[PDB]
């Protein structure tokens, strides 16, 4: 009965309310109405990250990237997913690509992207140092 945009808006309200599995289901309903909108998959990927569902998050980021190759958030969420999975070099590349795309698109997130890069590079270093 509701449209894809209305379902996305319902998902966004649930997300702000910290109802992550419910928000993800709402983005799934939006996808039923229009499966060609990258934002539905990026939003759902972020829900899956919060739910520790990394395999599902990775899959959504890949779907989003097939639809919008320039998506800052798909690259960023992909990098965060790879960092939590300890795939540090891939994570850093995707975070750096998010930074470059954000610069080209004149987007600013209060230094979130550089901050995440530093967190990722520090985690990678900690894993290297612990072998010593």
């Amino acid at each position: 009965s509701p449209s894809a945009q209305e379902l996305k808006e319902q998902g966004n309200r649930l997300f702000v309310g910290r109802k992550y599995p419910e928000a993800a289901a709402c983005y799934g309903r939006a996808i039923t109405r229009n499966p060609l909108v990258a934002v539905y998959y990026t939003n759902r990927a972020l829900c899956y990250l919060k739910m520790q569902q990394h395999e599902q998050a990775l899959a959504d980021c890949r779907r989003a990237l097939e639809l919008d190759g320039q998506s800052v958030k798909a690259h960023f969420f992909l990098g965060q997913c790879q960092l939590e999975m300890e795939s540090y070099d891939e994570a850093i590349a995707n975070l750096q690509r998010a930074y470059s795309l954000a610069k080209e698109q004149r987007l600013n997130f209060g230094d979130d992207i550089p901050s995440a890069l530093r967190i990722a590079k520090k985690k990678r270093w900690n894993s290297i140092e612990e072998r010593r």
């Binding site: 998902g11 702000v16 939003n43 800052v72 997130f109 979130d112 992207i113």
Partner: peptide, 5 residues
């Protein structure tokens, strides 16, 4: 950045 669109 960790917000929905």
């Amino acid at each position: 950045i960790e917000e929905v669109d």
